[PDB]
Amino acid sequence: QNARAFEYLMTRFSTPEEVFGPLSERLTSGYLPEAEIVFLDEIWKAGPAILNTLLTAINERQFRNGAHVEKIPMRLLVAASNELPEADSSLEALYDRMLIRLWLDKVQDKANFRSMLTSQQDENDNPVPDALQVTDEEYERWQKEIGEITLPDHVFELIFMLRQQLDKLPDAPYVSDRRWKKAIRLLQASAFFSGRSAVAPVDLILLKDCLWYDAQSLNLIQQQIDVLMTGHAWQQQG
Amino acid sequence: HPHLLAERISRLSSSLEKGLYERSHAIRLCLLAALSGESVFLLGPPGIAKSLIARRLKFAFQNARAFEYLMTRFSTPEEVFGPLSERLTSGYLPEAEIVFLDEIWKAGPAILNTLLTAINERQFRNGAHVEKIPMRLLVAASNELPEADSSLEALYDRMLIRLWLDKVQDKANFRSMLTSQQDENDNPVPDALQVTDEEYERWQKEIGEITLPDHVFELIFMLRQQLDKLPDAPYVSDRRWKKAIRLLQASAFFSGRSAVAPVDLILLKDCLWYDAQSLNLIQQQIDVLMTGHAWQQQGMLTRLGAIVQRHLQLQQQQSDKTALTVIRLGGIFSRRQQYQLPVNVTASTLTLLLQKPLKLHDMEVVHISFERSALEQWLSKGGEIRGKLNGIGFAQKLNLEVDSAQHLVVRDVSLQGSTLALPGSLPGEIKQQLEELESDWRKQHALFSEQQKCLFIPGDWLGRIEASLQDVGAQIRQAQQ
Ligand SMILES: Nc1ncnc2c1ncn2[C@@H]1O[C@H](COP(=O)(O)OP(=O)(O)O)[C@@H](O)[C@H]1O
Numbered sequence: 236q237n238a239r240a241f242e243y244l245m246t247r248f249s250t251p252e253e254v255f256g257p258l259s260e261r262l263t264s265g266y267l268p269e270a271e272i273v274f275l276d277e278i279w280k281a282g283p284a285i286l287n288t289l290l291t292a293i294n295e296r297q298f299r300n301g302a303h304v305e306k307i308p309m310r311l312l313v314a315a316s317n318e319l320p321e322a323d324s325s326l327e328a329l330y331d332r333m334l335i336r337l338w339l340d341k342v343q344d345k346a347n348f349r350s351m352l353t354s355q356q357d358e359n360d361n362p363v364p365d366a367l368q369v370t371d372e373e374y375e376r377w378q379k380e381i382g383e384i385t386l387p388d389h390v391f392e393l394i395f396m397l398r399q400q401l402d403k404l405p406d407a408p409y410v411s412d413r414r415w416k417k418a419i420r421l422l423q424a425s426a427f428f429s430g431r432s433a434v435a436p437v438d439l440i441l442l443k444d445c446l447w448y449d450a451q452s453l454n455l456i457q458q459q460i461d462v463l464m465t466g467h468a469w470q471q472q473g
Numbered sequence: 474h475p476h477l478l479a480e481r482i483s484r485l486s487s488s489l490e491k492g493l494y495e496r497s498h499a500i501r502l503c504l505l506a507a508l509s510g511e512s513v514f515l516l517g518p519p520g521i522a523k524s525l526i527a528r529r530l531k532f533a534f535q536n537a538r539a540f541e542y543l544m545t546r547f548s549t550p551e552e553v554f555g556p557l558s559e560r561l562t563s564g565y566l567p568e569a570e571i572v573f574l575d576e577i578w579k580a581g582p583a584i585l586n587t588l589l590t591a592i593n594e595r596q597f598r599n600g601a602h603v604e605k606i607p608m609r610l611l612v613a614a615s616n617e618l619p620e621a622d623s624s625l626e627a628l629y630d631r632m633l634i635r636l637w638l639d640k641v642q643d644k645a646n647f648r649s650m651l652t653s654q655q656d657e658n659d660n661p662v663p664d665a666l667q668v669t670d671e672e673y674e675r676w677q678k679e680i681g682e683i684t685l686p687d688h689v690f691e692l693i694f695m696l697r698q699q700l701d702k703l704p705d706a707p708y709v710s711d712r713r714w715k716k717a718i719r720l721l722q723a724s725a726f727f728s729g730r731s732a733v734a735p736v737d738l739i740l741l742k743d744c745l746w747y748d749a750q751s752l753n754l755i756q757q758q759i760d761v762l763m764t765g766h767a768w769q770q771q772g773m774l775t776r777l778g779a780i781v782q783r784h785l786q787l788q789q790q791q792s793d794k795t796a797l798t799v800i801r802l803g804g805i806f807s808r809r810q811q812y813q814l815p816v817n818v819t820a821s822t823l824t825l826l827l828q829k830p831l832k833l834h835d836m837e838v839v840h841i842s843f844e845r846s847a848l849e850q851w852l853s854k855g856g857e858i859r860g861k862l863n864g865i866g867f868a869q870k871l872n873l874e875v876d877s878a879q880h881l882v883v884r885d886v887s888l889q890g891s892t893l894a895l896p897g898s899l900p901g902e903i904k905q906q907l908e909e910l911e912s913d914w915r916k917q918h919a920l921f922s923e924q925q926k927c928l929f930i931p932g933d934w935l936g937r938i939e940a941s942l943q944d945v946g947a948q949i950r951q952a953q954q
Binding site for chain 2: 283284286287295302324328382386391413414416419
């Protein structure tokens with residue numbers, strides 16, 4: 236009911252004044268410090284000062300607005316690109332902090348391409364009804380009830396086992412401790428909006444887009460989880 | 474008054490630990506360096522809680538500011554110390570207290586040049602006049618190591634504490650860590666445990682007033698000469714030895730002490746090494762020093778040997794009263810058997826006395842000491858005996874055989890006879906000198922049983938110190954039996 240958009244393209248010669256609003260103390264009228272859902276395309280080529288300001292707006296939800304600081308009501312942070320960053324660069328600090336790594340691709344099915352090729356639905360209207368939109372009061376209350384989800388003993392036996400399996404495989408990517416803590420908030424939120432009070436074992440499917448980092452480790456993460464979900468989840472291989 | 478200071482620090486570090494498991498060695502080391510004006514370095518993979526410790530120690534004070542910046546390959550000094558108009562340093566580093574600099578091994582050339590003047594002088598140039606920086610804690614984290622021939626080594630050699638963090642390994646400490654409800658942006662430190670600005674300026678002057686005992690200097694100078702003789706040991710500059718004293722004097726200040734304690738030398742395990750190769754060498758030399766010359770472990774070993782030498786000297790003169798005799802079992806059996814003293818020696822290493830001394834291994838000997846759990850091997854399997862001499866050295870090969878009268882005749886290079894015997898089952902001269910050395914062990918043990926409550930000491934080091942003190946005490950109680 237109170238969301239704003241911000242579609243910006245990061246270039247090799249971009250300046251922080253053209254992103255967070257130019258100063259006069261900074262004219263942040265509809266940009267990022269007061270926005271909710273911002274879009275950043277081609278993030279792997281911005282300036283050095285642009286990436287440094289984005290790290291403080293994630294762990295603290297604040298911004299250095301000259302003298303006094305202020306909070307940022309950022310609810311969703313999305314970023315898209317095409318290529319991959321270097322192996323020894325400063326751009327890996329933001330990639331290791333992002334949770335979900337969606338892997339989109341072009342369409343392949345023929346039945347779903349007929350209506351998609353000739354679609355009359357507008358992409359700038361409001362297809363969401365006014366009765367299905369949440370208010371600002373319900374958002375602040377839901378941020379606290381997610382952490383109250385209990386962790387069953389059977390769920391912990393699969394998280395610790397998957398961590399030890401990737402450590403023994405040399406070709407498996409390294410997963411930091413921050414990724415394991417942030418992934419629980421995603422699984423607990425999935426069972427919260429599904430009519431459950433505890434962490435469901437089926438929620439481990441979403442971990443296929445939170446462990447890999449390149450195209451080489453994409454076929455390894457989706458393979459170990461497929462065996463885990465069809466082996467030790469509901470005691471398949473057991 | 475000094476005794477109540479150690480209790481206030483123990484309650485301050487307890488609230489800082491809430492939220493970060495298996496990180497007690499990293500928070501306690503940053504708290505002591507912040508109250509003494511020292512730096513700290515962290516190394517490890519990105520994602521092992523390296524930036525939160527810089528934002529957590531600021532809540533333990535009353536006027537602290539945070540500064541989390543990431544140094545890049547194209548970073549400029551104007552974006553770190555504030556742009557100029559004379560420089561707008563509103564909330565950056567010249568007026569901050571605890572700053573955080575991640576990936577410091579890739580900044581610009583002018584960035585590192587300004588960080589060197591803000592450490593030795595605590596100042597920063599600003600066009601014309603200069604000003605002081607109220608910096609209290611300097612932390613820097615990264616991932617890899619710099620080059621061997623580069624300009625980045627000027628800052629690494631100046632940092633004192635080199636923390637070695639790593640990912641979690643324990644399973645019990647990972648359950649509550651995986652699902653933690655503690656916020657990382659609140660104020661878990663109470664208002665009563667936060668020091669003021671007046672108490673900080675007063676503590677910085679009382680650290681230098683800590684006296685240096687004469688026994689403590691014997692351990693620092695010995696460690697410096699030991700690392701110089703080892704080619705694989707890392708080089709330690711003279712600046713590191715001077716800056717390490719401020720860390721040890723600050724540990725005893727917040728622990729209820731007025732002098733430098735020998736137990737404070739444990740913190741030197743993270744202030745000498747520089748890479749992963751020298752990490753296992755520094756922790757090995759200190760472990761031997763703390764269990765050898767700290768509380769006079771080996772110092773009493775060279776003194777107890779002189780008492781045993783004087784005691785065995787008066788016992789070998791009257792060894793003609795009772796000698797050694799091995800049985801000659803036969804009846805219905807082949808070769809006879811050979812053994813040693815029974816319950817008369819209740820130890821794994823028994824001693825033997827000889828009458829006529831000989832020259833074995835181009836040296837004189839007054840008593841032959843064998844192993845109780847190893848002498849039966851040669852006496853049953855046969856071959857060549859392996860025993861030490863004078864209670865020292867390795868198991869040398871001697872020329873021992875069986876005599877017609879069952880006597881351990883130790884032969885040499887001249888085919889000379891030497892019948893071994895046993896000491897008698899305590900003179901007044903030996904007992905008087907033994908009580909003087911035994912009383913010294915109780916004085917050294919009483920010091921460890923009073924200062925072990927230091928919060929800035931890891932728990933795994935107390936197991937090796939207690940095992941080293943009981944080993945010396947178990948040997949001094951053998952001669953008095
Ligand atoms: N070993 C750990 N134990 C507990 N919490 C951790 C650990 N590692 C990371 N975290 C949590 O992850 C969050 C972000 O950590 P971060 O600053 O990214 O670490 P780093 O600076 O090492 O990358 C912190 O709030 C911290 O609570």
